Amino acid sequence: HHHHLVHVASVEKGRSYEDFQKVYNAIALKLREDDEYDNYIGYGPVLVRLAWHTSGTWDKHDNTGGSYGGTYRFKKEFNDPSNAGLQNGFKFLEPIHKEFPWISSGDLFSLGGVTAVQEMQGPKIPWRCGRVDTPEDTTPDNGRLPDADKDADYVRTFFQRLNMNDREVVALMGAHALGKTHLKNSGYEGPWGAANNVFTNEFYLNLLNEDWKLEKNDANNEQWDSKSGYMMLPTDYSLIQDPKYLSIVKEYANDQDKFFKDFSKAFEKLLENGITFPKDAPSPFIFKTLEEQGL
Ligand code: HEM
Ligand SMILES: [Co+2]
Ligand SMILES: [Mn+2]
Ligand code: NA
């Protein structure tokens, strides 16, 4: 059994590193300017989640979904219950897309995530251009993004569809250092940590070090809560119930640099799943932060 859907990366006509650095800079400047959003968390976390949700529809079996097509712009995916709240990220990106109308939707959504991680002091994420918009009938159906009310076996099985192994899964879930759950979006409420617009290994430290109590929230869903005001989803808590996940959680809690390196690889892989880069395509771009540019 096999399929023949191939998505070849095609560089936006005549564009090079300097063009994409300008898009990065525009995103980063707006992150700095529109910093009141979500009680001064800012838009960084929602842009990371947008990049992940637009990429995380991928199915390795038939190459449907994924970042290439930019299909979140279509109402079926836009209105996926799993994507509730991402509209805020999309709205943030609208004036960026207006200024740089040549960038594909896929490139913009993925670059938004890269920019957010880097501007929030995370590792450098190499990023490749060339995603090409595909039509409305290529939009994947709802239900390909993960449920939160599940255990480690669910998590492991879920992520096999994205060709992610245990280490890649645990690394990727470290992004929950950023932002928070919002009851109206997901039926869960609260942050995973304190410094939730700074990219760190705090998710792993909190998971291991806090005193967690299994509680019911105001939407009648179970979540783990600490006296510090943090929370963990059942899927997150499963990373310390499963012995193979627990070993990796401990590794990243004890070595931020290792987490950063593994996250960077896994996040680039996530954003590139399903894309064929031709042999003569440009090398991955590593963008400078605003702080690096003195901007
Ligand atoms: C089993 C896998 C996962 C589950 C079940 C899950 C679940 C959730 C849920 C329920 C929220 C709250 C949404 C809201 O109420 O606004 C959330 C937020 C978030 N997740 Fe995940 N997540 C998963 C994996 C990931 C991955 C792989 C990434 C990135 C690499 C990620 C990044 C984020 C970010 C950045 C937010 C914050 C959004 C904000 O503050 O606006 N998550 N996640
Ligand atoms: Co098939
Ligand atoms: Mn065939
Ligand atoms: Na400010």
Side-chain angles (χ1 to χ4, degrees):
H1 190 135
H2 62 279
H3 303 266
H4 294 294
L5 190 54
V6 180
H7 288 314
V8 185
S10 184
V11 178
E12 288 92 333
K13 180 63 177 170
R15 303 289 167 181
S16 66
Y17 177 80
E18 186 190 347
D19 295 282
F20 297 101
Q21 182 72 71
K22 287 172 186 166
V23 182
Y24 178 106
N25 287 176
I27 294 164
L29 286 165
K30 192 180 176 63
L31 281 173
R32 182 194 285 166
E33 176 62 24
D34 297 1
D35 61 358
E36 312 207 329
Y37 174 79
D38 203 4
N39 296 303
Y40 290 79
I41 292 165
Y43 281 95
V46 74
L47 292 178
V48 177
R49 189 193 164 218
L50 179 62
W52 138 238
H53 278 206
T54 56
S55 303
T57 58
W58 189 59
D59 188 341
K60 70 179 183 192
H61 172 66
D62 57 10
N63 203 15
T64 54
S67 73
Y68 185 84
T71 50
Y72 176 85
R73 72 190 189 281
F74 300 117
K75 71 177 199 291
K76 189 174 65 169
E77 188 170 346
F78 197 80
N79 295 321
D80 186 346
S82 300
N83 291 337
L86 295 182
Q87 302 95 338
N88 297 316
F90 187 82
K91 264 192 177 71
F92 175 103
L93 295 170
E94 278 181 6
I96 307 298
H97 215 349
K98 192 178 170 183
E99 187 177 347
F100 305 97
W102 53 265
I103 199 167
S104 66
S105 282
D107 279 1
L108 186 58
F109 301 153
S110 61
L111 182 55
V114 168
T115 307
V117 170
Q118 292 191 184
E119 292 297 301
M120 292 188 293
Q121 310 181 45
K124 294 305 188 96
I125 316 292
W127 180 88
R128 305 185 83 160
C129 69
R131 297 167 191 78
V132 181
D133 289 356
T134 57
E136 185 153 28
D137 69 355
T138 67
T139 306
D141 286 351
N142 296 176
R144 301 184 169 209
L145 294 160
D147 300 323
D149 63 339
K150 293 293 193 294
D151 66 9
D153 299 331
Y154 172 90
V155 172
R156 182 169 284 111
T157 298
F158 175 80
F159 273 107
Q160 287 167 355
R161 206 200 68 227
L162 299 169
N163 193 35
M164 296 298 178
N165 65 33
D166 286 3
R167 172 171 294 280
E168 292 168 316
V169 169
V170 175
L172 286 168
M173 289 173 76
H176 287 153
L178 308 172
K180 66 189 288 291
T181 64
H182 304 264
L183 201 75
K184 288 160 75 72
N185 291 341
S186 64
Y188 296 95
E189 181 58 45
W192 292 268
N196 63 347
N197 63 14
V198 182
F199 195 94
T200 73
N201 71 338
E202 194 191 349
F203 169 75
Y204 309 103
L205 290 162
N206 291 353
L207 190 50
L208 294 171
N209 297 338
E210 294 287 296
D211 184 50
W212 297 109
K213 292 280 203 291
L214 183 57
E215 304 189 324
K216 252 181 181 185
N217 64 35
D218 295 342
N220 206 41
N221 295 313
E222 286 190 317
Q223 59 178 70
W224 293 88
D225 298 329
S226 82
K227 72 202 173 170
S228 310
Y230 313 147
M231 63 85 76
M232 294 281 153
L233 304 163
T235 46
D236 310 339
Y237 199 81
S238 89
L239 303 184
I240 60 161
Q241 300 178 292
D242 181 274
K244 305 198 207 83
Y245 288 152
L246 179 58
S247 301
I248 302 156
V249 169
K250 288 173 170 173
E251 189 179 345
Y252 296 152
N254 173 70
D255 188 347
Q256 193 177 258
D257 304 343
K258 182 63 180 178
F259 163 53
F260 273 28
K261 287 185 165 156
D262 287 359
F263 179 85
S264 181
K265 289 182 189 178
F267 197 57
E268 180 176 10
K269 177 178 169 176
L270 179 72
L271 300 185
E272 289 176 5
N273 273 338
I275 305 171
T276 306
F277 292 96
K279 286 295 214 283
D280 62 349
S283 293
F285 303 132
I286 296 163
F287 301 112
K288 299 184 176 70
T289 60
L290 296 179
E291 195 88 76
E292 259 181 290
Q293 294 165 271
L295 293 169

PDB file of all heavy atoms in Angstrom, residues 85-113:
ATOM      1  N   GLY A  85      -9.004  29.682  19.139  1.00  0.00           N
ATOM      2  CA  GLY A  85      -8.013  30.633  19.663  1.00  0.00           C
ATOM      3  C   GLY A  85      -6.903  31.019  18.687  1.00  0.00           C
ATOM      4  O   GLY A  85      -6.291  32.082  18.831  1.00  0.00           O
ATOM      5  N   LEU A  86      -6.631  30.169  17.695  1.00  0.00           N
ATOM      6  CA  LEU A  86      -5.587  30.471  16.705  1.00  0.00           C
ATOM      7  C   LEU A  86      -5.926  31.636  15.774  1.00  0.00           C
ATOM      8  O   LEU A  86      -5.026  32.245  15.190  1.00  0.00           O
ATOM      9  CB  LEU A  86      -5.239  29.223  15.893  1.00  0.00           C
ATOM     10  CG  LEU A  86      -4.597  28.096  16.720  1.00  0.00           C
ATOM     11  CD1 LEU A  86      -4.253  26.932  15.826  1.00  0.00           C
ATOM     12  CD2 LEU A  86      -3.349  28.592  17.453  1.00  0.00           C
ATOM     13  N   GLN A  87      -7.217  31.955  15.655  1.00  0.00           N
ATOM     14  CA  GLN A  87      -7.671  33.124  14.892  1.00  0.00           C
ATOM     15  C   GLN A  87      -6.906  34.390  15.296  1.00  0.00           C
ATOM     16  O   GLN A  87      -6.631  35.241  14.456  1.00  0.00           O
ATOM     17  CB  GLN A  87      -9.183  33.365  15.067  1.00  0.00           C
ATOM     18  CG  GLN A  87     -10.106  32.217  14.656  1.00  0.00           C
ATOM     19  CD  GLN A  87     -10.497  31.303  15.811  1.00  0.00           C
ATOM     20  OE1 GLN A  87      -9.804  31.243  16.842  1.00  0.00           O
ATOM     21  NE2 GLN A  87     -11.609  30.587  15.649  1.00  0.00           N
ATOM     22  N   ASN A  88      -6.554  34.495  16.578  1.00  0.00           N
ATOM     23  CA  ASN A  88      -5.758  35.622  17.081  1.00  0.00           C
ATOM     24  C   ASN A  88      -4.367  35.681  16.440  1.00  0.00           C
ATOM     25  O   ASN A  88      -3.871  36.762  16.118  1.00  0.00           O
ATOM     26  CB  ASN A  88      -5.624  35.556  18.612  1.00  0.00           C
ATOM     27  CG  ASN A  88      -6.963  35.685  19.324  1.00  0.00           C
ATOM     28  OD1 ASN A  88      -7.789  36.526  18.973  1.00  0.00           O
ATOM     29  ND2 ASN A  88      -7.182  34.844  20.325  1.00  0.00           N
ATOM     30  N   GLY A  89      -3.749  34.519  16.257  1.00  0.00           N
ATOM     31  CA  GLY A  89      -2.472  34.428  15.543  1.00  0.00           C
ATOM     32  C   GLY A  89      -2.617  34.780  14.077  1.00  0.00           C
ATOM     33  O   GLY A  89      -1.794  35.507  13.513  1.00  0.00           O
ATOM     34  N   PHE A  90      -3.669  34.268  13.451  1.00  0.00           N
ATOM     35  CA  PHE A  90      -3.927  34.559  12.053  1.00  0.00           C
ATOM     36  C   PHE A  90      -4.117  36.061  11.833  1.00  0.00           C
ATOM     37  O   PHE A  90      -3.570  36.625  10.874  1.00  0.00           O
ATOM     38  CB  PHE A  90      -5.164  33.800  11.568  1.00  0.00           C
ATOM     39  CG  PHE A  90      -5.407  33.924  10.088  1.00  0.00           C
ATOM     40  CD1 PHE A  90      -4.727  33.112   9.177  1.00  0.00           C
ATOM     41  CD2 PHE A  90      -6.328  34.853   9.596  1.00  0.00           C
ATOM     42  CE1 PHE A  90      -4.964  33.231   7.811  1.00  0.00           C
ATOM     43  CE2 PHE A  90      -6.560  34.983   8.227  1.00  0.00           C
ATOM     44  CZ  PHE A  90      -5.881  34.161   7.336  1.00  0.00           C
ATOM     45  N   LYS A  91      -4.887  36.692  12.722  1.00  0.00           N
ATOM     46  CA  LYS A  91      -5.140  38.144  12.657  1.00  0.00           C
ATOM     47  C   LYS A  91      -3.862  38.953  12.834  1.00  0.00           C
ATOM     48  O   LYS A  91      -3.650  39.937  12.135  1.00  0.00           O
ATOM     49  CB  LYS A  91      -6.201  38.592  13.677  1.00  0.00           C
ATOM     50  CG  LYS A  91      -7.616  38.688  13.103  1.00  0.00           C
ATOM     51  CD  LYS A  91      -8.568  39.398  14.057  1.00  0.00           C
ATOM     52  CE  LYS A  91      -9.963  39.551  13.461  1.00  0.00           C
ATOM     53  NZ  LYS A  91     -10.694  38.254  13.386  1.00  0.00           N
ATOM     54  N   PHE A  92      -3.007  38.523  13.755  1.00  0.00           N
ATOM     55  CA  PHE A  92      -1.679  39.122  13.922  1.00  0.00           C
ATOM     56  C   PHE A  92      -0.890  39.091  12.610  1.00  0.00           C
ATOM     57  O   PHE A  92      -0.252  40.078  12.239  1.00  0.00           O
ATOM     58  CB  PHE A  92      -0.932  38.386  15.045  1.00  0.00           C
ATOM     59  CG  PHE A  92       0.495  38.818  15.240  1.00  0.00           C
ATOM     60  CD1 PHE A  92       0.841  39.652  16.292  1.00  0.00           C
ATOM     61  CD2 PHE A  92       1.505  38.352  14.406  1.00  0.00           C
ATOM     62  CE1 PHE A  92       2.161  40.033  16.497  1.00  0.00           C
ATOM     63  CE2 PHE A  92       2.823  38.742  14.596  1.00  0.00           C
ATOM     64  CZ  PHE A  92       3.150  39.578  15.650  1.00  0.00           C
ATOM     65  N   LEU A  93      -0.921  37.951  11.922  1.00  0.00           N
ATOM     66  CA  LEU A  93      -0.165  37.797  10.683  1.00  0.00           C
ATOM     67  C   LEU A  93      -0.746  38.531   9.458  1.00  0.00           C
ATOM     68  O   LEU A  93      -0.027  38.710   8.486  1.00  0.00           O
ATOM     69  CB  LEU A  93       0.034  36.307  10.357  1.00  0.00           C
ATOM     70  CG  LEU A  93       0.895  35.525  11.349  1.00  0.00           C
ATOM     71  CD1 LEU A  93       0.804  34.035  11.055  1.00  0.00           C
ATOM     72  CD2 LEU A  93       2.343  36.015  11.352  1.00  0.00           C
ATOM     73  N   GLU A  94      -2.017  38.941   9.494  1.00  0.00           N
ATOM     74  CA  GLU A  94      -2.650  39.641   8.346  1.00  0.00           C
ATOM     75  C   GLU A  94      -1.883  40.875   7.831  1.00  0.00           C
ATOM     76  O   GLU A  94      -1.608  40.959   6.639  1.00  0.00           O
ATOM     77  CB  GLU A  94      -4.112  40.026   8.647  1.00  0.00           C
ATOM     78  CG  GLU A  94      -5.115  38.895   8.449  1.00  0.00           C
ATOM     79  CD  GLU A  94      -6.562  39.308   8.728  1.00  0.00           C
ATOM     80  OE1 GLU A  94      -6.836  40.506   8.980  1.00  0.00           O
ATOM     81  OE2 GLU A  94      -7.443  38.423   8.685  1.00  0.00           O
ATOM     82  N   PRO A  95      -1.540  41.832   8.718  1.00  0.00           N
ATOM     83  CA  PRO A  95      -0.751  42.979   8.229  1.00  0.00           C
ATOM     84  C   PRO A  95       0.671  42.605   7.773  1.00  0.00           C
ATOM     85  O   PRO A  95       1.236  43.295   6.931  1.00  0.00           O
ATOM     86  CB  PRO A  95      -0.716  43.936   9.434  1.00  0.00           C
ATOM     87  CG  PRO A  95      -1.081  43.093  10.623  1.00  0.00           C
ATOM     88  CD  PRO A  95      -2.009  42.041  10.099  1.00  0.00           C
ATOM     89  N   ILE A  96       1.224  41.513   8.296  1.00  0.00           N
ATOM     90  CA  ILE A  96       2.520  41.010   7.818  1.00  0.00           C
ATOM     91  C   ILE A  96       2.342  40.513   6.376  1.00  0.00           C
ATOM     92  O   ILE A  96       3.141  40.841   5.494  1.00  0.00           O
ATOM     93  CB  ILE A  96       3.087  39.852   8.690  1.00  0.00           C
ATOM     94  CG1 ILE A  96       3.150  40.207  10.188  1.00  0.00           C
ATOM     95  CG2 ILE A  96       4.468  39.433   8.194  1.00  0.00           C
ATOM     96  CD1 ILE A  96       4.044  41.361  10.550  1.00  0.00           C
ATOM     97  N   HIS A  97       1.287  39.737   6.140  1.00  0.00           N
ATOM     98  CA  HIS A  97       1.019  39.204   4.804  1.00  0.00           C
ATOM     99  C   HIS A  97       0.691  40.319   3.808  1.00  0.00           C
ATOM    100  O   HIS A  97       1.074  40.238   2.648  1.00  0.00           O
ATOM    101  CB  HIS A  97      -0.124  38.187   4.819  1.00  0.00           C
ATOM    102  CG  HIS A  97       0.041  37.057   3.854  1.00  0.00           C
ATOM    103  ND1 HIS A  97       1.008  37.036   2.874  1.00  0.00           N
ATOM    104  CD2 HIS A  97      -0.641  35.891   3.730  1.00  0.00           C
ATOM    105  CE1 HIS A  97       0.916  35.908   2.195  1.00  0.00           C
ATOM    106  NE2 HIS A  97      -0.076  35.195   2.692  1.00  0.00           N
ATOM    107  N   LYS A  98      -0.008  41.356   4.274  1.00  0.00           N
ATOM    108  CA  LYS A  98      -0.288  42.532   3.446  1.00  0.00           C
ATOM    109  C   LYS A  98       0.994  43.236   2.987  1.00  0.00           C
ATOM    110  O   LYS A  98       1.102  43.633   1.831  1.00  0.00           O
ATOM    111  CB  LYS A  98      -1.204  43.502   4.198  1.00  0.00           C
ATOM    112  CG  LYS A  98      -1.795  44.614   3.335  1.00  0.00           C
ATOM    113  CD  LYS A  98      -2.733  45.507   4.129  1.00  0.00           C
ATOM    114  CE  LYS A  98      -3.128  46.739   3.326  1.00  0.00           C
ATOM    115  NZ  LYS A  98      -3.995  47.658   4.111  1.00  0.00           N
ATOM    116  N   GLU A  99       1.965  43.376   3.889  1.00  0.00           N
ATOM    117  CA  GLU A  99       3.246  44.005   3.570  1.00  0.00           C
ATOM    118  C   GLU A  99       4.126  43.133   2.674  1.00  0.00           C
ATOM    119  O   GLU A  99       4.893  43.664   1.860  1.00  0.00           O
ATOM    120  CB  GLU A  99       4.011  44.380   4.852  1.00  0.00           C
ATOM    121  CG  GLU A  99       5.287  45.184   4.605  1.00  0.00           C
ATOM    122  CD  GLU A  99       6.018  45.617   5.874  1.00  0.00           C
ATOM    123  OE1 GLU A  99       5.452  45.535   6.985  1.00  0.00           O
ATOM    124  OE2 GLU A  99       7.184  46.034   5.749  1.00  0.00           O
ATOM    125  N   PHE A 100       4.024  41.810   2.827  1.00  0.00           N
ATOM    126  CA  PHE A 100       4.822  40.861   2.040  1.00  0.00           C
ATOM    127  C   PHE A 100       3.889  39.858   1.358  1.00  0.00           C
ATOM    128  O   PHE A 100       3.887  38.673   1.704  1.00  0.00           O
ATOM    129  CB  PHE A 100       5.827  40.143   2.949  1.00  0.00           C
ATOM    130  CG  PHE A 100       6.719  41.078   3.713  1.00  0.00           C
ATOM    131  CD1 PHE A 100       6.422  41.436   5.025  1.00  0.00           C
ATOM    132  CD2 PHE A 100       7.859  41.606   3.121  1.00  0.00           C
ATOM    133  CE1 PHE A 100       7.240  42.310   5.725  1.00  0.00           C
ATOM    134  CE2 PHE A 100       8.681  42.482   3.816  1.00  0.00           C
ATOM    135  CZ  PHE A 100       8.370  42.836   5.123  1.00  0.00           C
ATOM    136  N   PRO A 101       3.093  40.321   0.368  1.00  0.00           N
ATOM    137  CA  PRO A 101       2.053  39.470  -0.233  1.00  0.00           C
ATOM    138  C   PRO A 101       2.593  38.291  -1.044  1.00  0.00           C
ATOM    139  O   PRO A 101       1.848  37.370  -1.350  1.00  0.00           O
ATOM    140  CB  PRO A 101       1.272  40.443  -1.137  1.00  0.00           C
ATOM    141  CG  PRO A 101       2.258  41.497  -1.487  1.00  0.00           C
ATOM    142  CD  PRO A 101       3.153  41.646  -0.284  1.00  0.00           C
ATOM    143  N   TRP A 102       3.870  38.348  -1.383  1.00  0.00           N
ATOM    144  CA  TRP A 102       4.562  37.284  -2.112  1.00  0.00           C
ATOM    145  C   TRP A 102       4.829  36.003  -1.305  1.00  0.00           C
ATOM    146  O   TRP A 102       5.061  34.946  -1.897  1.00  0.00           O
ATOM    147  CB  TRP A 102       5.902  37.815  -2.656  1.00  0.00           C
ATOM    148  CG  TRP A 102       6.782  38.459  -1.619  1.00  0.00           C
ATOM    149  CD1 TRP A 102       6.865  39.788  -1.324  1.00  0.00           C
ATOM    150  CD2 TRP A 102       7.697  37.796  -0.741  1.00  0.00           C
ATOM    151  NE1 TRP A 102       7.775  39.997  -0.323  1.00  0.00           N
ATOM    152  CE2 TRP A 102       8.298  38.789   0.060  1.00  0.00           C
ATOM    153  CE3 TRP A 102       8.064  36.459  -0.552  1.00  0.00           C
ATOM    154  CZ2 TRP A 102       9.254  38.486   1.038  1.00  0.00           C
ATOM    155  CZ3 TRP A 102       9.013  36.160   0.415  1.00  0.00           C
ATOM    156  CH2 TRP A 102       9.599  37.173   1.200  1.00  0.00           C
ATOM    157  N   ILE A 103       4.857  36.084   0.024  1.00  0.00           N
ATOM    158  CA  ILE A 103       5.133  34.891   0.834  1.00  0.00           C
ATOM    159  C   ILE A 103       3.923  33.970   0.811  1.00  0.00           C
ATOM    160  O   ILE A 103       2.777  34.426   0.879  1.00  0.00           O
ATOM    161  CB  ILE A 103       5.587  35.252   2.273  1.00  0.00           C
ATOM    162  CG1 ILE A 103       6.305  34.054   2.924  1.00  0.00           C
ATOM    163  CG2 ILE A 103       4.419  35.741   3.122  1.00  0.00           C
ATOM    164  CD1 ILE A 103       7.038  34.409   4.194  1.00  0.00           C
ATOM    165  N   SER A 104       4.168  32.671   0.668  1.00  0.00           N
ATOM    166  CA  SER A 104       3.081  31.681   0.748  1.00  0.00           C
ATOM    167  C   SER A 104       2.521  31.632   2.159  1.00  0.00           C
ATOM    168  O   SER A 104       3.195  32.019   3.120  1.00  0.00           O
ATOM    169  CB  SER A 104       3.568  30.302   0.329  1.00  0.00           C
ATOM    170  OG  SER A 104       4.525  29.817   1.241  1.00  0.00           O
ATOM    171  N   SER A 105       1.274  31.183   2.284  1.00  0.00           N
ATOM    172  CA  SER A 105       0.628  31.066   3.585  1.00  0.00           C
ATOM    173  C   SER A 105       1.389  30.087   4.486  1.00  0.00           C
ATOM    174  O   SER A 105       1.630  30.385   5.652  1.00  0.00           O
ATOM    175  CB  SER A 105      -0.832  30.645   3.440  1.00  0.00           C
ATOM    176  OG  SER A 105      -1.611  31.760   3.046  1.00  0.00           O
ATOM    177  N   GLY A 106       1.781  28.946   3.921  1.00  0.00           N
ATOM    178  CA  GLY A 106       2.560  27.947   4.634  1.00  0.00           C
ATOM    179  C   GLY A 106       3.873  28.482   5.158  1.00  0.00           C
ATOM    180  O   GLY A 106       4.237  28.226   6.313  1.00  0.00           O
ATOM    181  N   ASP A 107       4.596  29.215   4.312  1.00  0.00           N
ATOM    182  CA  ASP A 107       5.849  29.848   4.725  1.00  0.00           C
ATOM    183  C   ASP A 107       5.622  30.852   5.847  1.00  0.00           C
ATOM    184  O   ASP A 107       6.393  30.889   6.799  1.00  0.00           O
ATOM    185  CB  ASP A 107       6.584  30.511   3.553  1.00  0.00           C
ATOM    186  CG  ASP A 107       7.381  29.523   2.713  1.00  0.00           C
ATOM    187  OD1 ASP A 107       7.370  28.306   3.013  1.00  0.00           O
ATOM    188  OD2 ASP A 107       8.048  29.956   1.750  1.00  0.00           O
ATOM    189  N   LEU A 108       4.551  31.640   5.756  1.00  0.00           N
ATOM    190  CA  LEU A 108       4.259  32.638   6.784  1.00  0.00           C
ATOM    191  C   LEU A 108       3.888  31.999   8.129  1.00  0.00           C
ATOM    192  O   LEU A 108       4.402  32.419   9.168  1.00  0.00           O
ATOM    193  CB  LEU A 108       3.151  33.598   6.330  1.00  0.00           C
ATOM    194  CG  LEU A 108       2.829  34.783   7.253  1.00  0.00           C
ATOM    195  CD1 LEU A 108       4.047  35.656   7.495  1.00  0.00           C
ATOM    196  CD2 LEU A 108       1.689  35.598   6.650  1.00  0.00           C
ATOM    197  N   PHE A 109       3.015  30.993   8.109  1.00  0.00           N
ATOM    198  CA  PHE A 109       2.577  30.341   9.347  1.00  0.00           C
ATOM    199  C   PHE A 109       3.760  29.692  10.064  1.00  0.00           C
ATOM    200  O   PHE A 109       3.915  29.838  11.283  1.00  0.00           O
ATOM    201  CB  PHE A 109       1.502  29.268   9.092  1.00  0.00           C
ATOM    202  CG  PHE A 109       0.247  29.769   8.424  1.00  0.00           C
ATOM    203  CD1 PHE A 109      -0.515  28.892   7.660  1.00  0.00           C
ATOM    204  CD2 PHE A 109      -0.204  31.087   8.568  1.00  0.00           C
ATOM    205  CE1 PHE A 109      -1.688  29.312   7.049  1.00  0.00           C
ATOM    206  CE2 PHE A 109      -1.372  31.506   7.944  1.00  0.00           C
ATOM    207  CZ  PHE A 109      -2.109  30.624   7.190  1.00  0.00           C
ATOM    208  N   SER A 110       4.585  28.984   9.299  1.00  0.00           N
ATOM    209  CA  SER A 110       5.757  28.304   9.848  1.00  0.00           C
ATOM    210  C   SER A 110       6.806  29.302  10.314  1.00  0.00           C
ATOM    211  O   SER A 110       7.355  29.152  11.401  1.00  0.00           O
ATOM    212  CB  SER A 110       6.339  27.292   8.845  1.00  0.00           C
ATOM    213  OG  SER A 110       6.774  27.914   7.651  1.00  0.00           O
ATOM    214  N   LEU A 111       7.064  30.336   9.512  1.00  0.00           N
ATOM    215  CA  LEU A 111       8.025  31.376   9.888  1.00  0.00           C
ATOM    216  C   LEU A 111       7.579  32.141  11.137  1.00  0.00           C
ATOM    217  O   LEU A 111       8.416  32.514  11.963  1.00  0.00           O
ATOM    218  CB  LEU A 111       8.283  32.341   8.725  1.00  0.00           C
ATOM    219  CG  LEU A 111       9.303  33.463   8.930  1.00  0.00           C
ATOM    220  CD1 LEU A 111      10.642  32.898   9.374  1.00  0.00           C
ATOM    221  CD2 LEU A 111       9.475  34.244   7.636  1.00  0.00           C
ATOM    222  N   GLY A 112       6.271  32.350  11.288  1.00  0.00           N
ATOM    223  CA  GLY A 112       5.725  32.952  12.503  1.00  0.00           C
ATOM    224  C   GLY A 112       6.136  32.205  13.765  1.00  0.00           C
ATOM    225  O   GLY A 112       6.518  32.824  14.762  1.00  0.00           O
ATOM    226  N   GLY A 113       6.088  30.876  13.714  1.00  0.00           N
ATOM    227  CA  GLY A 113       6.503  30.040  14.827  1.00  0.00           C
ATOM    228  C   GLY A 113       7.994  30.131  15.103  1.00  0.00           C
ATOM    229  O   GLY A 113       8.413  30.280  16.257  1.00  0.00           O
TER     230      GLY A 113
END
